[PDB]
From Swiss-Prot:
EC number: 3.1.-.-
Enzyme class: hydrolase
Cofactor(s) listed: Zn(2+)
Gene this protein is translated from: rnj2
Organism whose genome encodes this protein: Staphylococcus epidermidis (strain ATCC 35984 / DSM 28319 / BCRC 17069 / CCUG 31568 / BM 3577 / RP62A)
Record: residues binding substrate: 357-361
Residues annotated as binding Zn(2+): 67, 69, 135, 157
Covered range of the whole protein: 7 to 444 of 557
Record's protein name: Ribonuclease J 2
Transmembrane region(s): none
GO molecular function: 5'-3' RNA exonuclease activity; RNA binding; RNA endonuclease activity; zinc ion binding
Keyword vocabulary terms for this entry: Cytoplasm, Endonuclease, Exonuclease, Hydrolase, Metal-binding, Nuclease, RNA-binding, rRNA processing, Zinc
Length: 435
């Protein structure tokens, strides 16, 4: 029988990125996600301060990674330099973590444990199960910690989109079973909680991308995260239909892509991909360049190309730009500055369609669907700035979660439960580590 529960965000509240959520059930502690954030010169990345975990490291039973986005796994190698705990994730997530460990030349012996939606990981106080979620990277998993009070469910990043199948398909039946069995606390993604309706389905997104790219008279540069496999696949498809080759600019894309291709995640025509060095050999209208940072920070790379400071390839008069990111308080200024730089350089920015809502994260109706499936007793909105958390809390109340059981937390807050009351009466060390 479980007695005491603690839920502590170390990153990913008050921001979109660097997600890391500590859950303790009595004397066992679990880290849910371990993301990085790209700085809002003199810092490459920002990771959570894990001093609290270090002070209690003997109780850390595992790091559970939902999906291979940098905002979910970016810190893992740095965490592992301080603590030896097992790393649980999908087969794709695990492969991406290994690649990051290699990239940093880290020799330390890591205990990876591949999990899937059938995995049940048994600990002394709890069992942990998983369910497939839909996101822009395949084989994403939500995490379900079973306690004697009911399940503690962490969604990670997710949306609901019936046009995505295969390794993107959600486990709706398993999710309904979890909700039916009794969810004590839902910890859910707030990124797009301020946006009404549903995300535009990806089949519609791909058709609008086609229309936009077919108008492009010169070169096309697409800026996105290395982990946005959906967008990458769309570009590959459209390139094939438009008789354009595709080239990658940035290592984390070449690496993430090679890994994923070897594992069977991509549908690639022969003769489509070319090395960045061979791009100048084509007419401009026969090339799409997908650009992400060397670190997988796309806008940084765009910014350099716009200012003609990039090492490998720069923007020219008449290039067209497709920016495939939504923005956060942290990235707003660099996006704005980068857009100005592009227009100054004579590039054409492909406009967002007004009818198109493109995100990897559930809008209001998708978050309500998760709330209505899970039927949680307590709700902790995370993965968002405070305004997004508030918007998500409002949705929870609409679905019928008792407003006194919805907790709005900041980094380092401790939500605790003793079997009678849920409280927020303690803080632990938290903050940003600049790398």
């Amino acid at each position: 029988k479980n007695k005491d529960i603690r839920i502590i965000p170390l990153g990913g509240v008050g921001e979109i990125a660097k997600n890391m959520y500590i859950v303790e059930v009595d004397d066992e502690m679990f880290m849910l996600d371990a993301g990085l954030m790209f700085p809002e010169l003199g810092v490459d990345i920002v990771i959570p301060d894990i001093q609290y975990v270090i002070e209690n490291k003997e109780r850390l039973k595992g790091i559970f990674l939902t999906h291979g986005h940098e905002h979910a796994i970016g810190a893992v190698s740095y965490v592992l330099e301080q603590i030896d705990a097992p790393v649980y994730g999908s087969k794709l997530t695990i492969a991406l973590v290994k690649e990051a460990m290699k990239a940093r030349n880290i020799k330390k012996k890591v205990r990876y444990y591949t999990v899937n939606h059938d995995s049940i990981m048994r600990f002394k106080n709890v069992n942990v199960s998983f369910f497939n979620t839909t996101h822009s990277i395949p084989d994403s998993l939500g995490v379900c910690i079973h306690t004697s009070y009911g399940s503690i469910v962490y969604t990670g990043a997710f949306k609901f989109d019936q046009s995505l199948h295969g390794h993107y398909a959600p486990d709706l039946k398993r999710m309904a079973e979890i909700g039916d069995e009794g969810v004590f606390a839902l910890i859910s993604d707030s990124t797009e909680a301020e946006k009404p309706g549903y995300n535009t389905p990806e089949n519609i997104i791909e058709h609008h991308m086609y229309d936009a790219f077919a108008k492009v008279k010169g070169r096309l540069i697409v800026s996105c995260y290395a982990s946005n496999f959906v967008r990458i696949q769309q570009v590959l498809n459209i390139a094939s239909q438009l008789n354009r080759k595709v080239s990658f600019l940035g290592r984390s894309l070449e690496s993430s892509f090679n890994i994923a291709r070897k594992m069977g995640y991509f549908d690639i025509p022969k003769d489509l991909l070319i090395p960045i060095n061979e791009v100048e050999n084509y007419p401009k209208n026969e090339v799409i360049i997908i650009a992400t940072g060397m670190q997988g920070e796309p806008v940084e790379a765009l910014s350099q190309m716009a200012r003609k400071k990039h090492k490998i390839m720069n923007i020219e008069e008449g290039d067209s730009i497709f920016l495939a990111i939504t923005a956060s308080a942290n990235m707003e200024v660099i996006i704005a500055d980068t857009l100005n730089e592009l227009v100054r350089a004579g590039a054409h920015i492909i406009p967002n369609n007004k009818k198109i809502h493109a995100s990897s994260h559930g809008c209001m109706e998708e978050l309500k669907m998760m709330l209505n499936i899970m039927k949680p007793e307590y709700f902790v909105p995370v993965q968002g700035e405070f305004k997004m958390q508030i918007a998500h809390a409002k949705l929870a109340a609409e679905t019928g979660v008792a407003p006194e059981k919805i907790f709005l937390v900041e980094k380092g807050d401790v939500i605790s439960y003793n079997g009678k009351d849920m409280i927020l009466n303690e803080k632990v060390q938290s903050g940003n580590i600049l790398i």
